[PDB]
Amino acid sequence: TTIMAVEFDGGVVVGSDSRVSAGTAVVNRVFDKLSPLHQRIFCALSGSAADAQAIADMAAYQLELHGLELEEPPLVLAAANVVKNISYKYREDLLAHLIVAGWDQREGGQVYGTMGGMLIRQPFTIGGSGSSYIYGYVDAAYKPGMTPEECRRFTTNAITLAMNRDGSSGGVIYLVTITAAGVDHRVILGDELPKFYDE
Amino acid sequence: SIMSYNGGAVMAMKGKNCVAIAADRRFGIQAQMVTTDFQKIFPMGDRLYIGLAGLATDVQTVAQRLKFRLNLYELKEGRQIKPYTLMSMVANLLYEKRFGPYYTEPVIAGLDPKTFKPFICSLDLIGCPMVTDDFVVSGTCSEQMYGMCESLWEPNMDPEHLFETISQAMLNAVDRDAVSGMGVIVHVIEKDKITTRTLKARMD
Amino acid sequence: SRRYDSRTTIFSPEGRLYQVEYAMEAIGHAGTCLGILANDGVLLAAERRNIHKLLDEVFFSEKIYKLNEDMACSVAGITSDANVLTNELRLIAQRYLLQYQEPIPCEQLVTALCDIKQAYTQFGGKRPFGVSLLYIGWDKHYGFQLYQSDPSGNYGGWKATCIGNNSAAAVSMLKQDYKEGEMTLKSALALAVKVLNKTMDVSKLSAEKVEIATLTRESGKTVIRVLKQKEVEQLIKKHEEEEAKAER
Amino acid sequence: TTIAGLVFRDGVILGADTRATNDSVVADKSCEKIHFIAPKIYCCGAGVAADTEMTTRMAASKMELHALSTGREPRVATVTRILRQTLFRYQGHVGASLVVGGVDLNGPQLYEVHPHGSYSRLPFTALGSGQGAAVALLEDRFQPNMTLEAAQELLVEAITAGILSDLGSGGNVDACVITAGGAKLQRALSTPTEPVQRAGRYRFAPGTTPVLTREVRPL
Amino acid sequence: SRGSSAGFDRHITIFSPEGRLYQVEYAFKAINQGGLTSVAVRGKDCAVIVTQKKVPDKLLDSSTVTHLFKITESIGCVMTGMTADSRSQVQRARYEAANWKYKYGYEIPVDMLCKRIADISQVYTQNAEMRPLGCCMILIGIDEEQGPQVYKCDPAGYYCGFKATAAGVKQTESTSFLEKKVKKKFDWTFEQTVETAITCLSTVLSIDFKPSEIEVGVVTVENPKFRILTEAEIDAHLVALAE
Amino acid sequence: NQYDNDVTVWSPQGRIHQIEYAMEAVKQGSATVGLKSKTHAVLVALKRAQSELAAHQKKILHVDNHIGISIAGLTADARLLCNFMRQECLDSRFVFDRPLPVSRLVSLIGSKTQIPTQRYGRRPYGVGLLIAGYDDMGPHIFQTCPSANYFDCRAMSIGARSQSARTYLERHMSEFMECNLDELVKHGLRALRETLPAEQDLTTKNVSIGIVGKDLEFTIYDDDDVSPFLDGLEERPQ
Amino acid sequence: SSIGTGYDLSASTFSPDGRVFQVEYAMKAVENSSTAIGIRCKDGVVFGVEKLVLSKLYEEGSNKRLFNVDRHVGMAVAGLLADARSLADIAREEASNFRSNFGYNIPLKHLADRVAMYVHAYTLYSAVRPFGCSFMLGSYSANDGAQLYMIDPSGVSYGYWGCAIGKARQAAKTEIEKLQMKEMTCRDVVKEVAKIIYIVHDEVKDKAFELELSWVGELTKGRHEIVPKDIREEAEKYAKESLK
Amino acid sequence: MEYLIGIQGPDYVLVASDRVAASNIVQMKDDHDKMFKMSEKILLLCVGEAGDTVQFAEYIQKNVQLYKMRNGYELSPTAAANFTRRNLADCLRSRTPYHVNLLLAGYDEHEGPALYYMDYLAALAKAPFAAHGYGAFLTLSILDRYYTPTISRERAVELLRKCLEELQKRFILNLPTFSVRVIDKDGIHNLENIAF
Amino acid sequence: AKRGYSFSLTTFSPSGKLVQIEYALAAVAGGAPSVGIKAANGVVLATEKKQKSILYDERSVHKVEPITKHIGLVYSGMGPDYRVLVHRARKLAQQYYLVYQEPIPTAQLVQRVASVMQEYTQSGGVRPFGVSLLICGWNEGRPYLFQSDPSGAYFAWKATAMGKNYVNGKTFLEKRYNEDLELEDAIHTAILTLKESFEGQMTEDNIEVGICNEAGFRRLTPTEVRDYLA
Ligand SMILES: [Cl-]
Ligand SMILES: [Cl-]
Ligand SMILES: [Cl-]
Ligand SMILES: [Cl-]
Ligand SMILES: [Cl-]
Ligand SMILES: [Cl-]
Ligand SMILES: [Cl-]
Ligand SMILES: [K+]
Ligand SMILES: [K+]
Ligand SMILES: [K+]
């Protein structure tokens, strides 16, 4: 699994890969790891598939109720806290890292990392098994104030490289862009995928 | 193995308007035998029997706890139990102990009250039902019993021939198992009568 | 909260329990139910209160319940409370069987339910079961037996007894006719029809209006049967024929 | 156990084998691995046989109850979620890997659900011991919007592949076809192996068996 | 012998000699204690809610005084009766609606939400420890399969689907008004259904009110999102009536 | 009356009678006086005997090194609240290692005493306390009642004929802030003296005094330890 | 106005005319208590309470009727003060729970909504009695602006530009209607709050009183706190001299 | 390691148990009784874990006595044995199981002489003769050899003699004294203890 | 926070009559009329569904409800209380099926549902149900008709009526009903008994009717009801 979230002025970009694997066998080469907590809030799934999906569902549920009680779209910070809280309450019992990114009126596009039950906000975040191989890439390929399209290239590139290096990462790249206007969901097929040094 | 501790062999067969059920008569702990006349087949009513193979305590416990639920069924309902219903009753009883199960694999054999129809089945230690039109086996000599039944069983057998087949299948399969024997008890079930027989089995 | 409390499990100035004695009145308006002990058996005879041209007749009985392989009971009072108690009687009988692997002695099963009914009169703040029960059975200790149960949770063993409508008139009628130590099942069946005929309301007596079950020991097995309509018809007519031979 | 699900134009098709193995010996040569959930929703069970059976029956019961209170044709998406949460509660101790397929107001849907509580939605999948063989065929010969007849044939081929290639897979292949008009369950759709024939008659003349004791109870 | 009483049957939810529940019957009179009237009408393409908005003084924040409530993106409701009782039922409704989606994965139908609250209102009717809620909930929303829906639930536990419904003080006069408008088969458009609801409340109360004096919530086939109309949009429908 | 049997029943006037009936228990108990300076907080109470053969009842009780109380009302309700105060002070020293601020302890009384006044079957605490303590904010005199309401006060008196003591303290309330400890206790004694009838005055057997402040921890003087305070007395005037 | 004997003893019992009198009698307890006031200005919210001096022996600042529920939220109470403190504790725990779950300062409307549910819960059963007080909640931020809410014994909560509870709630509201609070700075508002308290106060029935005042606006950086001795005494002099 | 033995005849039950109370390598007692009186005609002989045996045996003993008081009559040997079986089987899948191997001997007025064998796993079996302990491996063959269902009491004690002599000769543990008792029509009779 | 009453609200009067049950019997006796007829090859259940206004959607709520594939329900009395008994009976039918893998015998359902009704006559802080149930079913190739009431007592019927004019409805059935009817004939005499107590004109919207046979239980469509109304 390789998951990525990048922050820009208008909103955010959340990236994922398409593969789930059981050891050396792949059980789903087409899996969308981008789950919406709310209309403008998304999370990226990593770790135990069952645990990740279970947390995603509860977070969406609590935030749905939270939204109704406030009669306002939930803050992303709020979204991030619920996920952090569930992850922390059961750190030993649940094996998952969820990246929560979205848009709210108060603070715009924001990116949060909840790995291990901690809360941190970053210009961009990577998670999953695949993230190890791209730590160098992201550090050298990052510039402040990248445009939506620049952000999409960035997350796509990083994940592509991770996918090729990682055995646990593969398939197609799933991309969402969150802005004040709406949610843009796109998929990149293998033929569309960026090319680098392969051999 | 936990099943291997006490041993035992239970078998059921199907025939022309009749069913047969047999078990070994041994009660023994690992190295030694204690009793020659141990009961493993228990009547759950006229024309319906259950055979239990595995751990002797759970064999006795399940039989007693099933009778508890059977009698309450036969009192609440104004009828005698159907073979399919007993199968589901044992299945529910065993599955309730999913993560702490009784170490016994039961075998239901009997004719359906009212409708005459023959019925034979066997279950897991956690209560998974298996219905066949021929035979079902359970015990420590499962492989030995399977080898006999597959070679000996025929589609339409009369009570006279069914007894001979189910006996020979039990006799020779038991003689290859070190933890089963000390006599074989056979029940032949018909509409008119029930025939109970102990066979001249090896006592070694 | 205590404003709405009826105080069911409380003592009266005289030293009695109101809800228990008020429940006794409910039994008096219910069907007449009698039990008679004989030398070679024991039987229950009860008045059917559910009688109509439009009733279906699905079950074997209306007021007679099989509790055990060797035991049966009859009921007088609120039928829904009776269903709860009879179901519990079937449970306790099976719990004993599971533990000891032999049928529960007659007196012990009565004792167990009576302890439950007594508990409802002492604690819980709940209404008692408005039911009186007649138990008939056979155990290996005292043989053929007959018991009576009160809503108070009090019991007693009888040779002949009755509960329900016109109960005091039925028992004094039995007290005169019952021949201690000489009673056979055939004599007890004839006495049952005699007592019911004088006690019951509709006068003439019918096979739809009465319900009789016999408990006998046959071939080392306890046999319990609810008598068929053709059998009851002969029992009523045999008393009817002796009613015609009483004048000269 | 080899089980597979296929999505086609008019609906879905589910397949299963009929072999149940105890230890490394075959107990049932004819067991039903396609389970009734709703009139138009069926589930294929692989894993612990008792677990698959009971989990399935539980779902089916809950689904009937749901339909009764709702008064509407049940949703397959509903079935999937029910299953997940129950299975998640038990942390994978209920050994049930399932393929659930059905038709909705929302169309034909195929889900796979794992004993730990993960689920995934897809056009085609295969679970169980012989999944490798079945996935191979689907990966090889699956096109979207297949005609029913092509879909029937491919599914059979996929499951057949598992039967022969896998040791824990055998017996006949059962198929269940779900269309908006109806759901047709075809038991023993295809049987690759038929050996009824025996060369020897092992019959015994009465009296061959030595009897010590005889007792007869007439009824 | 109509209206006989014995015991504590007037104080707790137990039976009278007639077999009535007075505590339940008093809860219907608690709906009228709010001093307001709510009207709901269903069309072919829409479902409309209307209720009088009384603001005693300008010291009150007018935006916070409402009986129009959102339970789901698709499902809204109007509340009639005790204000505190009403808000408790709305919070429970939102809980039940979100709880339904978590268990079953699809949006709660209008009829199923109404039944669920009716079943909980039944508990107060059978148990003596608590009183029934002196309020009334009229639910609107669009079912994906059965079109527009208008549902109403009771403190008694009664629930039903309607073509048109009123609640509150002027309930009985406004139901008779709606009956007369139903018999005549109009073309039930968005404008027709809104104005039928508005004119109903404007005749029974006889006011010809300002846009600030009423509240309107609508659900339409093209836009299933529950929306409160605000002052400007209601003003457009009020000048449309005077044409 | 029918609005006076339960705490959960409101009177049509907008009152709870069971709280007011519990307030009557405080007035029936013997008088106690509490007052403070800028450095010290002094409690002076009147011990009472049912008969001359029986000894006098305890009025002053220990809570902690920096906090002490005087009781008025039911004995068992006084001991129950005293044990709660002790437990809260112990928990504070166990966790934070610093003495529990008086203001916060009284707030915990207010929270606890409120609970039974709103629950059916429960009853209000039939005791009123005068709490004398010393912390970072200096000396404190606090007053608690059967009603969970509490007061921060310069001086206070509760019990039988406490009005006479209340009026004395009200005249000399500006005197207390610059008072010497020996002069402060005499003011508390002279207030308590006003409560007694004209025939009898303060004796060594019926007077109990408790002092806490900057100098020392809370200390109770009873019999022989009390006479230094009584000696040097301005005679009872009228 | 009242029903005797049966229909007014329990909150689980409706009266024949559809009223819960136990709630209404709890509403009478606040009507007997001294007046609490609070209004919403252009850049915040100001509170004011008359605190009747029962005895001169009590400290200046005792029986505080202005509470700090949260760093940004203030509470003004009227009624049975024992219940007022328990509701202050309930409101404090609710604001604490929101930050522990969602990570930021609770919106005032939601806080008012949450506490009102707790108040309402005590009006349904015979096992408990309704709260015998009414209270106000005020806050200010740059995003939500100035907000003011009030909750009564029944569990009803509404937003306010100007609100008053207690003895002379009617005498206060008519004096509030005179003010252009939508345009007034909260510094000017304090002066007007102080004078309405003095006009409302009955000097010939009630003995004497103290004035409690609270801040929550832009001048206090969004934090709820007490109005300093300097500003209060200026407002008190303003109150006494414009009383003629 | 202890030893129990029972021999059922046509109208009697003969039972014997060793009198050794052993700790690690020492014999603490020479005269310890391992028999428990349940009724006038019921004996329960228990063997196994040090503390578990007495606690379990007495618990059943007191419950059989409780039945006698509550009903006026004693439990039958079968009902008693099934009661002990139920209590042990219910503790099998618990946190604390009882590792006790027991032998119940009784006389019924209807069924006659009875002898019951029971595992620590709580499996019940009726036997004409049974033995517990490691000594059973050396004695069950002697019992198989000379036992007839019509054995007289005179021959039964002599058959027991043959079994106990085998324990002296071949068995590695020192078991010099044995408790011997007979149950019949008249009840339990204490018989001369067999010493070596 | 709350905690329920632990004392019975139904107690024995000096007469020996549980007054609250008879008071609950008055609630059903005053409710809309319902009729059930067992007819040799099937069972029919019919009720008055007169909502007394044209504003109501006659299709939204139902009085004749299915419990399972082979069992149905009709009631006289209060609607809200009936709903609870339906949901409880539906669960009891599934609880039986999960254990035994067999369609629940009608007699066994009624026994289990009547036992739930018994609880509310003895349990603390609760009133009895103000509903009498009419349960139909098909099992072992035989039609079944049962009545359950507030008491917790149950009766087996060939034909019966309850609600408004239940006394006149029964006497009508005593003369009109004969054993060995055909199912389609039973619908007629069910609507005829319903016409005896109606008051107004009968449309397919004014009444609700369900049938039970070997093919299971189902509610008759408005089009089917219209055809019998001639
Ligand atoms: Cl990074
Ligand atoms: Cl990670
Ligand atoms: Cl039995
Ligand atoms: Cl196979
Ligand atoms: Cl209404
Ligand atoms: Cl005192
Ligand atoms: Cl209680
Ligand atoms: K499930
Ligand atoms: K008064
Ligand atoms: K600010």
Side-chain angles (χ1 to χ4, degrees), chain I:
Chain I
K2 80 272 186 68
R3 172 255 196 87
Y5 302 144
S6 304
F7 49 86
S8 294
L9 291 172
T10 309
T11 53
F12 284 95
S13 62
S15 304
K17 283 161 173 59
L18 299 159
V19 212
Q20 273 291 316
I21 291 164
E22 286 172 32
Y23 281 12
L25 279 163
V28 32
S34 299
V35 57
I37 297 158
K38 195 185 89 77
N41 69 323
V43 200
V44 65
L45 294 169
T47 181
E48 182 189 296
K49 199 192 176 169
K50 204 171 184 290
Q51 258 76 48
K52 296 143 68 195
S53 181
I54 202 73
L55 295 170
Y56 289 82
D57 201 305
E58 309 87 9
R59 323 154 86 204
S60 58
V61 192
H62 300 278
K63 292 178 82 173
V64 187
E65 296 274 36
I67 310 241
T68 179
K69 258 90 173 187
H70 70 287
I71 288 172
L73 247 191
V74 184
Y75 80 107
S76 288
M78 289 183 292
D81 289 22
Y82 166 70
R83 219 111 43 73
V84 179
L85 293 153
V86 173
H87 187 263
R88 193 70 167 268
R90 282 173 181 172
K91 285 176 80 181
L92 285 161
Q94 292 303 308
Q95 282 175 52
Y96 190 96
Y97 193 86
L98 282 162
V99 174
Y100 302 113
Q101 285 279 289
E102 188 188 329
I104 185 168
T106 317
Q108 292 296 307
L109 183 89
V110 183
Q111 278 175 211
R112 283 167 167 89
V113 179
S115 202
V116 176
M117 275 167 150
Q118 195 280 325
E119 274 189 292
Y120 287 73
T121 66
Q122 200 168 11
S123 289
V126 286
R127 58 156 186 86
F129 295 100
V131 187
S132 291
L133 300 166
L134 279 167
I135 314 94
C136 74
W138 184 280
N139 51 101
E140 256 79 39
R142 198 196 181 274
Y144 287 95
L145 177 70
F146 283 91
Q147 185 203 141
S148 190
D149 59 12
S151 176
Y154 65 96
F155 316 99
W157 292 93
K158 295 179 180 290
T160 188
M162 52 173 59
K164 288 168 190 172
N165 284 47
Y166 79 97
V167 280
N168 289 335
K170 279 220 292 288
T171 55
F172 174 84
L173 286 160
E174 286 180 56
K175 285 162 163 283
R176 188 77 65 170
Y177 168 83
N178 295 69
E179 286 186 57
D180 209 57
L181 295 171
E182 207 83 336
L183 186 58
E184 27 268 304
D185 292 315
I187 288 106
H188 268 286
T189 173
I191 271 86
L192 282 171
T193 316
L194 209 66
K195 260 188 275 185
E196 212 81 34
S197 319
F198 194 70
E199 203 169 22
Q201 111 262 303
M202 274 194 173
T203 59
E204 68 268 52
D205 300 358
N206 285 321
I207 61 166
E208 200 179 321
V209 48
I211 52 157
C212 181
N213 57 3
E214 66 201 69
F217 172 84
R218 67 169 180 92
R219 190 194 295 104
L220 294 176
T221 51
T223 317
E224 283 176 312
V225 187
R226 203 225 319 177
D227 296 5
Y228 280 93
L229 262 49

Side-chain angles (χ1 to χ4, degrees), chain F residues 25 28-30 48 59 71-74:
Chain F
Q28 287 191 323
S30 55
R48 216 175 215 170
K59 289 284 286 180
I71 66 160
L74 308 178

Side-chain angles (χ1 to χ4, degrees), chain B residues 73 76-77 79 82 85 88-89 92 114, chain I residues 96 99-102 105 108 111-112 140:
Chain B
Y73 182 87
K76 288 179 197 180
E77 312 266 334
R79 59 172 173 177
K82 293 179 85 72
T85 313
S88 298
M89 187 187 280
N92 191 63
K114 297 183 290 171
Chain I
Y96 190 96
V99 174
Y100 302 113
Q101 285 279 289
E102 188 188 329
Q108 292 296 307
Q111 278 175 211
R112 283 167 167 89
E140 256 79 39

Side-chain angles (χ1 to χ4, degrees), chain B residues 159-177:
Chain B
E160 294 269 300
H161 282 253
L162 182 68
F163 160 72
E164 299 291 324
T165 299
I166 210 274
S167 293
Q168 289 297 310
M170 273 294 290
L171 261 327
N172 298 289
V174 151
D175 291 2
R176 279 287 164 179
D177 193 17

Side-chain angles (χ1 to χ4, degrees), chain F residues 190 193-194 234-238:
Chain F
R190 210 170 291 110
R193 207 180 207 170
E194 295 283 298
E234 289 202 321
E235 283 294 80
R236 197 152 151 83
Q238 260 175 44

